[PDB]
Amino acid sequence: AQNPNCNIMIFHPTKEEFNDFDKYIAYMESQGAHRAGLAKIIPPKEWKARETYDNISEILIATPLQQVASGRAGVFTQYHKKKKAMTVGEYRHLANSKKYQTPPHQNFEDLERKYWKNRIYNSPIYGADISGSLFDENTKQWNLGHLGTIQDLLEKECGVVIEGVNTPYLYFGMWKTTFAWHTEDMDLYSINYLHLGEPKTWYVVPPEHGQRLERLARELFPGSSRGCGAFLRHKVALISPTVLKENGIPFNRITQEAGEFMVTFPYGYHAGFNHGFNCAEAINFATPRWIDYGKMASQCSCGEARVTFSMDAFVRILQPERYDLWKRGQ
Numbered sequence: 001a002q003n004p005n006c007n008i009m010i011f012h013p014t015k016e017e018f019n020d021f022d023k024y025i026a027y028m029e030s031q032g033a034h035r036a037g038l039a040k041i042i043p044p045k046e047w048k049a050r051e052t053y054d055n056i057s058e059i060l061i062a063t064p065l066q067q068v069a070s071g072r073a074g075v076f077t078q079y080h081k082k083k084k085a086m087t088v089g090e091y092r093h094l095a096n097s098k099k100y101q102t103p104p105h106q107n108f109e110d111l112e113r114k115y116w117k118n119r120i121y122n123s124p125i126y127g128a129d130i131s132g133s134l135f136d137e138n139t140k141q142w143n144l145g146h147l148g149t150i151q152d153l154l155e156k157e158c159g160v161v162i163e164g165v166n167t168p169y170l171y172f173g174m175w176k177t178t179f180a181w182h183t184e185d186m187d188l189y190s191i192n193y194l195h196l197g198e199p200k201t202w203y204v205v206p207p208e209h210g211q212r213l214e215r216l217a218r219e220l221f222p223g224s225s226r227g228c229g230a231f232l233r234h235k236v237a238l239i240s241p242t243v244l245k246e247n248g249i250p251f252n253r254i255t256q257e258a259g260e261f262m263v264t265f266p267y268g269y270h271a272g273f274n275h276g277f278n279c280a281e282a283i284n285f286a287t288p289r290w291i292d293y294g295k296m297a298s299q300c301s302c303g304e305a306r307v308t309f310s311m312d313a314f315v316r317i318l319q320p321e322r323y324d325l326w327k328r329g330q
């Protein structure tokens with residue numbers, strides 16, 4: 001078996017290997033990449049997402065979110081307080097202000113230490129789930145707005161045409177902006193491109209060990225667990241690497257830099273944080289191997305995890321027994 005220790009693998013496709021997206025995902029899995037839950041893909045040197053980022057300042061962040069923590073430094077939840085709209089240029093200025101800017105630091109490890117020590121004492125603001133794309137329409141390879149759709153994958157594998165669409169999202173981050181522990185909706189894959197700015201540090205649990213993280217989370221967030229059997233779906237809970245190690249949870253970490261792609265694999269729990277002002281683009285996708293994960297994915301039906309209307313068809317077709325209860329949640 002390839003990659004038995006479930007290490008995060010890093011790939012360097014040539015320009016020829018970068019033509020056929022589906023083929024390269026399958027190649028990475030042939031090498032065991034999916035066992036880690038996350039892989040990095042460094043594009044060939046000839047490739048670019050777009051010509052420049054000089055003209056992005058007028059994009060609107062209609063509802064910036066202030067991420068307010070509660071708990072202890074290594075075990076906390078966050079809620080999102082809505083703020084007034086601002087442009088990307090205004091957000092970049094805010095991120096660089098004395099209140100929000102990245103502190104002096106020696107290297108990524110020092111910054112990671114500072115994040116886990118001090119995150120809860122600040123409330124950074126970020127732009128999330130903004131429908132749109134920064135790929136140039138003429139970028140033909142790994143253009144996140146031109147991937148095959150999940151609806152077409154389901155139809156090709158299972159024979160059923162379904163409603164729904166599948167478009168990318170933009171994210172604008174700053175120092176300490178945080179993504180809580182989660183898997184994707186319906187345990188889909190995701191792909192994430194860091195277009196511009198400072199890094200993003202990721203943590204990931206191998207899919208084969210996801211239920212170990214779930215068990216720890218139920219212990220550490222006991223009221224949340226009583227409220228919902230799939231509360232990690234709410235995307236609010238953080239657990240530090242120190243606490244994971246103390247509890248024996250298998251995980252890995254890696255830092256993504258501008259110009260790099262990250263792929264998350266079905267049922268790969270992940271979390272992380274931004275180092276400073278940045279802009280990323282991400283979308284969910286499927287392959288034939290996903291279908292079995294989609295059939296088995298847990299669901300939140302308590303009301304908290306509202307999602308896109310595209311997920312209706314996925315539950316309806318893949319999880320008909322669960323559909324009525326889940327639909328009542330939505």
Ligand SMILES: COc1ccc(C[C@@H](C(=O)NN)c2nn[nH]n2)cc1
Pocket residue numbers: 128171178179180181182184190192235236270280281282
């Ligand atoms: C508080 O929790 C969340 C906040 C934001 C995301 C979005 C995240 C991701 O992993 N989405 N699937 C991402 N971060 N950079 N680009 N995307 C996920 C969880």
Ligand code: NA
Pocket residue numbers: 006007251252
């Ligand atoms: Na490891």
Ligand code: NI
Pocket residue numbers: 182183184190264270
């Ligand atoms: Ni994710």
Ligand SMILES: [Zn+2]
Pocket residue numbers: 227228229230231233234300301302303304305
């Ligand atoms: Zn719930």
